[PDB]
Amino acid sequence: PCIEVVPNITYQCMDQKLSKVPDDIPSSTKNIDLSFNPLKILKSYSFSNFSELQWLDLSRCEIETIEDKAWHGLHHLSNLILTGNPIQSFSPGSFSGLTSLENLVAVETKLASLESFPIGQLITLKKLNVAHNFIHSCKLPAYFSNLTNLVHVDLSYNYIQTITVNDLQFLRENPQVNLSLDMSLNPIDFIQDQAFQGIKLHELTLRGNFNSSNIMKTCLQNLAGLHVHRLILGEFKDERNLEIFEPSIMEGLCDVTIDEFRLTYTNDFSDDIVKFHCLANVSAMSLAGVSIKYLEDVPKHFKWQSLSIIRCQLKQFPTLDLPFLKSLTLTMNKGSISFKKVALPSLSYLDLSRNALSFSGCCSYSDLGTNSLRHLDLSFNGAIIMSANFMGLEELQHLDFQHSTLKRVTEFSAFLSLEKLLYLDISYTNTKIDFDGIFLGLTSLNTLKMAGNSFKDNTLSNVFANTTNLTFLDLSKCQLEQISWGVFDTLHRLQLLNMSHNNLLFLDSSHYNQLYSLKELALDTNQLKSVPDGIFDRLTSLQKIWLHTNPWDCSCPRIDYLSRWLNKNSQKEQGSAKCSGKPVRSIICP
Amino acid sequence: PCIEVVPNITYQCMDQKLSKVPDDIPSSTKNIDLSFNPLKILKSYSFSNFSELQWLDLSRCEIETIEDKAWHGLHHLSNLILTGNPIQSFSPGSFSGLTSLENLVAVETKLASLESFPIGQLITLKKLNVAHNFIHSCKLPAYFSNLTNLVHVDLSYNYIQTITVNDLQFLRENPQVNLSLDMSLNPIDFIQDQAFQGIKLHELTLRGNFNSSNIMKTCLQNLAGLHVHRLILGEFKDERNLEIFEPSIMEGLCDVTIDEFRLTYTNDFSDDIVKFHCLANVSAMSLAGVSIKYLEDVPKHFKWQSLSIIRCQLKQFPTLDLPFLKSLTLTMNKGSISFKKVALPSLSYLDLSRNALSFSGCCSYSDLGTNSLRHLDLSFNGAIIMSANFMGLEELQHLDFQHSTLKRVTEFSAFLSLEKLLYLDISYTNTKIDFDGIFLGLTSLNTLKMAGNSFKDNTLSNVFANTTNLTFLDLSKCQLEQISWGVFDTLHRLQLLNMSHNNLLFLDSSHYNQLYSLKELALDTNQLKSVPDGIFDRLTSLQKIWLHTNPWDCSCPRIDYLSRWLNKNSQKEQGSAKCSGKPVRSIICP
Amino acid sequence: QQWFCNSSDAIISYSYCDHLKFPISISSEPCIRLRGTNGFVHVEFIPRGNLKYLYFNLFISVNSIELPKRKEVLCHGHDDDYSFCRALKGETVNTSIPFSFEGILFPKGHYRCVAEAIAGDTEEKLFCLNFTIIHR
Amino acid sequence: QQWFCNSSDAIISYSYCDHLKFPISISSEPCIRLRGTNGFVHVEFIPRGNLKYLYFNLFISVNSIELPKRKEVLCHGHDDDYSFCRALKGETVNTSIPFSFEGILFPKGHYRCVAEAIAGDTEEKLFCLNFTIIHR
Numbered sequence A, B: 001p002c003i004e005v006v007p008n009i010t011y012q013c014m015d016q017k018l019s020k021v022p023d024d025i026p027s028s029t030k031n032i033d034l035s036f037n038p039l040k041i042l043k044s045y046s047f048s049n050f051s052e053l054q055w056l057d058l059s060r061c062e063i064e065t066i067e068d069k070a071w072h073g074l075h076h077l078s079n080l081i082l083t084g085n086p087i088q089s090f091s092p093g094s095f096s097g098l099t100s101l102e103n104l105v106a107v108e109t110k111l112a113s114l115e116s117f118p119i120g121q122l123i124t125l126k127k128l129n130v131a132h133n134f135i136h137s138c139k140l141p142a143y144f145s146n147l148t149n150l151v152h153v154d155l156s157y158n159y160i161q162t163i164t165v166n167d168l169q170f171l172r173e174n175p176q177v178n179l180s181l182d183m184s185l186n187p188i189d190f191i192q193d194q195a196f197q198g199i200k201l202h203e204l205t206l207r208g209n210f211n212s213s214n215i216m217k218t219c220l221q222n223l224a225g226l227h228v229h230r231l232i233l234g235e236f237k238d239e240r241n242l243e244i245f246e247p248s249i250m251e252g253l254c255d256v257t258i259d260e261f262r263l264t265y266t267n268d269f270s271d272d273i274v275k276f277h278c279l280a281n282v283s284a285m286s287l288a289g290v291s292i293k294y295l296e297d298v299p300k301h302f303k304w305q306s307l308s309i310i311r312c313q314l315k316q317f318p319t320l321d322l323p324f325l326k327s328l329t330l331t332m333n334k335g336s337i338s339f340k341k342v343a344l345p346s347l348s349y350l351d352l353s354r355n356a357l358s359f360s361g362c363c364s365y366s367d368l369g370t371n372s373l374r375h376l377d378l379s380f381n382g383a384i385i386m387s388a389n390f391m392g393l394e395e396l397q398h399l400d401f402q403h404s405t406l407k408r409v410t411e412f413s414a415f416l417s418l419e420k421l422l423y424l425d426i427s428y429t430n431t432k433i434d435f436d437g438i439f440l441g442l443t444s445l446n447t448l449k450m451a452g453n454s455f456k457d458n459t460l461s462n463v464f465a466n467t468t469n470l471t472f473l474d475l476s477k478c479q480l481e482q483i484s485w486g487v488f489d490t491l492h493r494l495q496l497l498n499m500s501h502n503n504l505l506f507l508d509s510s511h512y513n514q515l516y517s518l519k520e521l522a523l524d525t526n527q528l529k530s531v532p533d534g535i536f537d538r539l540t541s542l543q544k545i546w547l548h549t550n551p552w553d554c555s556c557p558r559i560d561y562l563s564r565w566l567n568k569n570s571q572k573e574q575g576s577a578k579c580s581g582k583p584v585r586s587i588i589c590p
Numbered sequence C, D: 001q002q003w004f005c006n007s008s009d010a011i012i013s014y015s016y017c018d019h020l021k022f023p024i025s026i027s028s029e030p031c032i033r034l035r036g037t038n039g040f041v042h043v044e045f046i047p048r049g050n051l052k053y054l055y056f057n058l059f060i061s062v063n064s065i066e067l068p069k070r071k072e073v074l075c076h077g078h079d080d081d082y083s084f085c086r087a088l089k090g091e092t093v094n095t096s097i098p099f100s101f102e103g104i105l106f107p108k109g110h111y112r113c114v115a116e117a118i119a120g121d122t123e124e125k126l127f128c129l130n131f132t133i134i135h136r
């Protein structure tokens, strides 16, 4: 009754009206999904034959009872998912036998407290998810000292209203423990005075906790003494939100040492919130889904080393001169902004993708004020007008223009400075290649994605003379009809060549005599009817070839070379080149 | 020796080493270009046979002497061009016989003054160009009262240093005269006190007159009392320029009534200059080639009814709420700006073309704050994201997206509100038509330009069902391979249909049975090899057809209908459909 | 069939898709006025997969004229706006989602919209609703 | 042939085109340094047409590799930046045009650029210069 997914390895038994685990499941199975079956009770020894089982999903199985040896034989189980089962009471030894468990998901099991939760001997446990239960105390139990590998606890969507000094005793005692706490969607209204003195946390998430500004401000103050690597704050659109969100609500954050600060959606927002003085010593600042309209005049003594603005609502490109900023991500912005010059002397990573951005004067040192740029993403944007070939930016390794409207890139050697560039994507930029020198200087280029463009006279010209180290070349959907002589004689290290979905009418045998490294050649979906004799003879490294969806002329002796070649090399052909219906590989001339 | 340009009408005798006018020129000639010939002297009666001559160009003819009857017989000459001839002295009666002259060009003839210039009886003269001479006085001679039709005098590039009260006496006496004065490139350093009291001018151009700010400010003050329809001010890049250009330089303009103000290039500029209070009562404001960076906070009591910003350098789209502004042109801006919402309740004309502009949220009433928009040009821009179908803007008659990157226009009926739209151009927008309802609502559309795009599966779909009043349809370069059934059955009034430069493989005879008005059908440059019999039979209005550049199969009886049809209708075929070389029109099957 | 409501300019109803019947209770308050509406989408169901990367495939047609497939991402997997992006397979989801739209002219007639919810990490189909909207 | 100059990184010379020999004196001060230059283009000639709509067709090649034709408009016909846009056919033109450019990396080698001046209202060719630039 179980859908066999990967034979003797993975089985999908979901929603099969099973009353018990099927004994038909092979003993070598590593992954079993038993969810949405009315199991009701986990009987002893039910899984004792699955000695290699690693992942077991019992979500929504109506389980009320875990028998005292229900998991006998599961020495290798690392993931156990009990979501939605009304177990409520986990009697002592309920998890006996799970000696390799790393991830325990007890979401919505009517669990009432961690103190009574018998996980004190799952010494391998790394992650504990007890979201959506009836937990009302923030007390980290003492047996957490046995769980030396526990790094994450999810307390989201419970009934915790208070955090006391004693609740965090365990972490105060054990400053060496790396622990992350997700407290989201808990109705917290009281944090005891000094509850967070001597407390260290990796990641602390406080999302959707507060209904009132005064309660949030009062609780944030008593985070004092806390040391967090990553603090995540904000609300949800589908929950009752704060009336007003002023910066002074976060006055308490000044008594917290924060390495990384993440702000998410808030109903109310003001641009000053991101300039709040208590965020000055943060090294990674992040905004996601935030109604920020203007990011301007960030004090230069701010120590932000990375800034992340995602799915926000900037009306106008930020003015930033942060001298210690190394990474900048502004992506999926709501609206269209025009690029404005920045002065970021430490900038080495720049992602400006998916902004419908319009960039006038790309690209050189004066646009960015940095000599250390290695990554530049300008994809999924509007008009990018090429006017300078990257003087001052010769450290650039990664360049992506995908789906932006590249303008004037073919009127000079737009990439001549980029002698360390490894990756270039100008796919679907509506570029009409009309200059053989378009790729001069790209001697380090390994990956060239330029699909969806076109060439003058629909002829593939000699643009690859300098790109001697190309290993990946994607020329699909370029409306190509023919290839000039010698276009590939330099690409001795090319491993992939995709020219599918063009309009090639003939091939020449000379273009493929020096593709010594070529492993994959895509020629499907063209207008090809024949190939010259021996065209594939020197492709000594070939492993895959696509030749289908072509109107092949299967008359003898014309189809002789191709049919015999496709037959002898039938393991390499992907799909079926069929005659204008019999595979070309199945044709024997006299 | 004269190049015959239009037989017996237009002759091009330029630079033929002619010593005199050739007697071979036919007597009905209307236009003669004799420039760059060493004529040296215009002898009497030389042109007396050219009774129908209207335009005579004698530029650079080394003429020193006009004999006393040089223009005998030229009763119909309206244009006479004497540029570059060192005549210097124009003796009395030098222009006798030119009884219909409308345009006299005496540029660079070493003319020293207008008082001695014998034009007092050219009562038909409309335009007088005496630029680039030795004129040193601004005195408009008294005989201008005889020249009741003179509307323009070009005094550019002379030696006028002073403008006195008496110099403008003639215009003071004659307030009914409509006269324009071009004073550009004159070294003006003194305007007499009250010289412009009681003076009215249509167009006054003052470009490149001033080397010093103080001299320009002092001279502008004494324009007081002047009433000009159009004042043009500015400098040239290739001339010595003002050290500084502050608004107070134009303090004198407050004592001038100006209907239209044009500012051109200035070396120095400040954004405040456009907000100068002396420009408040102007009705047409214009900036061309000006280094303005920000146009913001124009006082609402400004009476500008049209604003023109051309080839300027706006870093950021203007914020404008001028309630009386009817026309706005922001074009060829240096850089890329993003559109910002404006509030222009009187706006009826909007040209935002050639800005590499990025528009997020096109288009509806809230973007513009007007219900009276009739013209919208957003062509040659960047990313234009369609998100609203023009609610609030149903008065729109003209819509141009040419060469912009239209995004998401095919995901709804983007033009449903535009029931008065006459003209739509979405050519070369990289639009892939995939929605048959893309043109719903366009029932008033007469002109549809959509070349350079493409269609799903390269099939022309049924997108023209509502565009019942189309008269012009351009579908060229759309990579079309075939046409769905019934696509044209609604277009009874279509007069032009351009489907050239596609990849049509066959035509169907049914698509052309209801093109009752079709005059011009472009089908050249496809992949067509044959047509169904009688496909052109019901094209009763056809006058031109393009069928060349197609691989026609000229085998009988297949090519029979087409060859006989092309022969019988050979006056309509443009170019030559030739067989895969003999014209198809020259083939007689048995 | 499964639910319907009356607007001043719209009649909206849905059933389960013929190929997928995983249950879910969806409604809007108030009924959607295509001229413009501020309201809530009430959702109560038990998902058949995690919602961490929930997105929708919408196949829309107007008077049998089909629009291209559109993909609407609701949970991107990182700091998402909605509390249900955290929900796991088998967990009870009960939420009210505010929405507000205005000022798009819709052609009159008969709309079909099959809405296909996908768990983007596994690409598995969570549920499928067959909507019918009659404008005017 | 007609003129030439020496830069620190460029040798620049021009002749008249083989098909059009209408005379014109052009030079730059200083000689153009392709790394960057502020200077003047001195022009003295008598045009064979009005310059109201003067534009240039530039046919450029680098080491015999041809670039697409580019069109550079100098006079648009309305409030133009340069005093010579007013000049008429047969009128003496004598002007110095300031220019300033910087920060484009040019490949080394042998450039050809035929520069074709066109009167845009009549489409007639005013003159044609055959340039040679040797970078490095």
Ligand SMILES: CCCCCCCCCCCCC/C=C/[C@@H](O)[C@H](CO[C@@H]1O[C@H](CO)[C@H](O)[C@H](OS(=O)(=O)O)[C@H]1O)NC(=O)CCCCCCCCCCCCCCC
Pocket: A360, A361, A385, A387, A388, B334, B335, B336, D012, D026, D027, D028, D032, D041, D099, D100, D101, D102, D103, D104, D113, D115, D131, D133
């Ligand atoms: C004796 C022979 C006569 C020779 C005369 C030749 C003319 C001299 C060149 C004139 C400069 C052109 C304007 C460019 C300005 C750049 O400085 C320009 C600034 O363009 C930026 O790019 C964006 C779009 O334009 C934004 O608009 C920016 O604006 S922003 O503020 O918003 O960001 C703007 O700055 N950078 C460039 O790389 C463009 C190209 C550089 C021109 C190099 C030409 C080399 C000429 C070689 C001479 C050899 C003889 C010629 C034979 C025919």
Ligand SMILES: CCCCCCCCCCCCC/C=C/[C@@H](O)[C@H](CO[C@@H]1O[C@H](CO)[C@H](O)[C@H](OS(=O)(=O)O)[C@H]1O)NC(=O)CCCCCCCCCCCCCCC
Pocket: A385, A386, A387, A408, A411, A412, A413, A437, B311, B332, B333, B334, B354, B380, D058, D060, D062, D067, D072, D104, D106, D107, D111, D113, D133
């Ligand atoms: C090596 C010696 C040979 C060199 C030949 C010398 C010729 C001089 C070239 C002039 C270039 C500058 C012109 C730009 C003016 C801006 O102003 C212009 C602003 O853009 C337009 O500027 C107009 C002014 O009004 C209108 O505003 C237009 O509006 S439009 O819609 O009507 O079109 C607007 O867009 N910037 C740009 O385009 C982008 C920057 C130019 C890129 C040029 C790169 C280098 C060109 C030199 C070729 C050598 C290649 C060597 C092979 C590797």
Ligand SMILES: CCCCCCCCCCCCC/C=C/[C@@H](O)[C@H](CO[C@@H]1O[C@H](CO)[C@H](O)[C@H](OS(=O)(=O)O)[C@H]1O)NC(=O)CCCCCCCCCCCCCCC
Pocket: A334, A335, A336, B360, B361, B385, B387, B388, C012, C026, C027, C028, C032, C041, C099, C100, C101, C102, C103, C104, C113, C115, C131, C133
């Ligand atoms: C019980 C059934 C459950 C029903 C739930 C259905 C969801 C309801 C729709 C949610 C609204 C979507 C967001 C749009 C906001 C606009 O208001 C939006 C604002 O977009 C502007 O466009 C730009 C790009 O986005 C800029 O970004 C602007 O920004 S700006 O400031 O810089 O200029 C931004 O404003 N205008 C629009 O025209 C977009 C389309 C309008 C949506 C109409 C949907 C009608 C739904 C009909 C329901 C029938 C039942 C459904 C069956 C599946």
Ligand SMILES: CCCCCCCCCCCCC/C=C/[C@@H](O)[C@H](CO[C@@H]1O[C@H](CO)[C@H](O)[C@H](OS(=O)(=O)O)[C@H]1O)NC(=O)CCCCCCCCCCCCCCC
Pocket: A311, A332, A333, A334, A354, A380, B385, B386, B387, B408, B411, B412, B413, B437, C058, C060, C062, C067, C072, C104, C106, C107, C111, C113, C133
């Ligand atoms: C009649 C009843 C049937 C209706 C079906 C109901 C389904 C609900 C439709 C939802 C539409 C609004 C979604 C936009 C969200 C903005 O937010 C969105 C912002 O743009 C993206 O928003 C993402 C949010 O994060 C990412 O930022 C993206 O970044 S990305 O690169 O990853 O892609 C970014 O670009 N605006 C737009 O796209 C343009 C405005 C939407 C146009 C929709 C027009 C009407 C659609 C309804 C179809 C009915 C047609 C009837 C035939 C005439």
Ligand SMILES: CCCCCCCCCCCCC/C=C/[C@@H](O)[C@H](CO[C@@H]1O[C@H](CO)[C@H](O)[C@H](OS(=O)(=O)O)[C@H]1O)NC(=O)CCCCCCCCCCCCCCC
Pocket: C026, C041, C043, C051, C054, C056, C072, C073, C074, C084, C093, C097, C098, C099, C100, C101, C115, C129
């Ligand atoms: C778990 C299973 C789920 C089952 C039900 C699915 C949920 C249905 C609703 C989800 C999105 C509605 C929230 C809309 C917010 C916008 O209203 C709001 C955008 O609107 C603008 O936002 C601005 C500030 O944000 C301003 O406010 C603007 O105003 S302005 O005038 O100032 O400029 C306003 O236009 N934000 C968004 O992200 C837009 C993206 C929403 C579309 C994506 C999903 C659409 C429907 C999903 C599938 C349809 C099938 C439904 C039944 C199966």
Ligand SMILES: CCCCCCCCCCCCC/C=C/[C@@H](O)[C@H](CO[C@@H]1O[C@H](CO)[C@H](O)[C@H](OS(=O)(=O)O)[C@H]1O)NC(=O)CCCCCCCCCCCCCCC
Pocket: D026, D041, D043, D051, D054, D056, D072, D073, D074, D084, D093, D097, D098, D099, D100, D101, D115, D129
């Ligand atoms: C009558 C016959 C003529 C025969 C000779 C032809 C004239 C030769 C020179 C004409 C243009 C030079 C002036 C350049 C100004 C730019 O320099 C200046 C742009 O540069 C930027 O402008 C900004 C403020 O404007 C900032 O200043 C920028 O700086 S930034 O750092 O602040 O951002 C700066 O980059 N303006 C322009 O219009 C650019 C357009 C000029 C190119 C168009 C013609 C190019 C050559 C023409 C044909 C070549 C053949 C020559 C021999 C036949």
Ligand SMILES: *[C@@H]1O[C@H](CO)[C@@H](O[C@@H]2O[C@H](CO)[C@@H](O[C@@H]3O[C@H](CO)[C@@H](O)[C@H](O)[C@H]3NC(C)=O)[C@H](O)[C@H]2NC(C)=O)[C@H](O)[C@H]1NC(C)=O
Pocket: A161, A186, A187, A211, A240
């Ligand atoms: C701020 O957020 C709180 C949520 O964390 C809201 O308070 C909670 O409101 C729930 C109702 O919306 C209460 O539920 C009910 O619980 C009581 C027991 O206290 C039962 O008798 C009721 O039957 C039950 N509701 C139903 C329908 O049966 C929560 O008990 C309550 N929790 C707390 C800690 O107060 C606040 O209302 C909210 N404020 C605003 C303005 O939205």
Ligand SMILES: *[C@@H]1O[C@H](CO)[C@@H](O[C@@H]2O[C@H](CO)[C@@H](O[C@@H]3O[C@H](CO)[C@@H](O)[C@H](O)[C@H]3NC(C)=O)[C@H](O)[C@H]2NC(C)=O)[C@H](O)[C@H]1NC(C)=O
Pocket: B161, B186, B187, B211, B240
């Ligand atoms: C402001 O603009 C003025 C131009 O209108 C400049 O002044 C003119 O300068 C010319 C030289 O640049 C002078 O030309 C010469 O004229 C004298 C007779 O006055 C002759 O002897 C000289 O031989 C002749 N030059 C040559 C090379 O032969 C103009 O006469 C003179 N005109 C006036 C009215 O002054 C100013 O110099 C200029 N200021 C700046 C700072 O550029």
Ligand SMILES: *[C@@H]1O[C@H](CO)[C@@H](O[C@@H]2O[C@H](CO)[C@@H](O)[C@H](O)[C@H]2NC(C)=O)[C@H](O)[C@H]1NC(C)=O
Pocket: A151, A178, A180, A202, A203
């Ligand atoms: C503390 O524990 C967490 C366990 O997840 C560690 O976190 C991760 O670091 C790796 C690499 O730096 C990333 O790929 C993960 O995404 C991180 N996860 C989280 C939740 O942050 C963290 O490095 C540990 N700190 C130590 C061991 O010093």
Ligand SMILES: *[C@@H]1O[C@H](CO)[C@@H](O[C@@H]2O[C@H](CO)[C@@H](O)[C@H](O)[C@H]2NC(C)=O)[C@H](O)[C@H]1NC(C)=O
Pocket: B151, B178, B180, B202, B203
């Ligand atoms: C004053 O004289 C000029 C003569 O040119 C008239 O000007 C023109 O008006 C027409 C239509 O309004 C335009 O097409 C021209 O471009 C205008 N030319 C100029 C130079 O402005 C002007 O209308 C006359 N005023 C009258 C007769 O009242």
Ligand SMILES: *[C@@H]1O[C@H](CO)[C@@H](O)[C@H](O)[C@H]1NC(C)=O
Pocket: A441, A443, A465, A466, A467, A468
């Ligand atoms: C790059 O191309 C140039 C041709 O101008 C050639 O001289 C040079 O050796 C090439 N170098 C590489 C690494 O491709």
Ligand SMILES: *[C@@H]1O[C@H](CO)[C@@H](O)[C@H](O)[C@H]1NC(C)=O
Pocket: A451, A476, A498, A499, A500, A501, A520, A522
């Ligand atoms: C070739 O390009 C096509 C078109 O995008 C793509 O589907 C295919 O995967 C490519 N072939 C490869 C990568 O081998």
Ligand SMILES: *[C@@H]1O[C@H](CO)[C@@H](O)[C@H](O)[C@H]1NC(C)=O
Pocket: B441, B443, B465, B466, B467, B468
């Ligand atoms: C427009 O198309 C609709 C189809 O939905 C049709 O009912 C209507 O009569 C058409 N009107 C015109 C003028 O094309």
Ligand SMILES: *[C@@H]1O[C@H](CO)[C@@H](O)[C@H](O)[C@H]1NC(C)=O
Pocket: B451, B476, B498, B499, B500, B501, B520, B522
């Ligand atoms: C058809 O389109 C081509 C391509 O732009 C154009 O050259 C031709 O003039 C058009 N034919 C007409 C307008 O009759």
Ligand SMILES: *[C@@H]1O[C@H](CO)[C@@H](O)[C@H](O)[C@H]1NC(C)=O
Pocket: C016, C017, C018, C019, C114, C130
């Ligand atoms: C949606 O419902 C219509 C009408 O009942 C039906 O014809 C169509 O097949 C359905 N589409 C699905 C279930 O995908």
Ligand SMILES: *[C@@H]1O[C@H](CO)[C@@H](O)[C@H](O)[C@H]1NC(C)=O
Pocket: C042, C044, C094, C095, C096
């Ligand atoms: C889910 O929420 C709705 C309120 O919109 C209501 O039916 C009830 O509170 C919840 N249903 C349950 C818990 O079954």
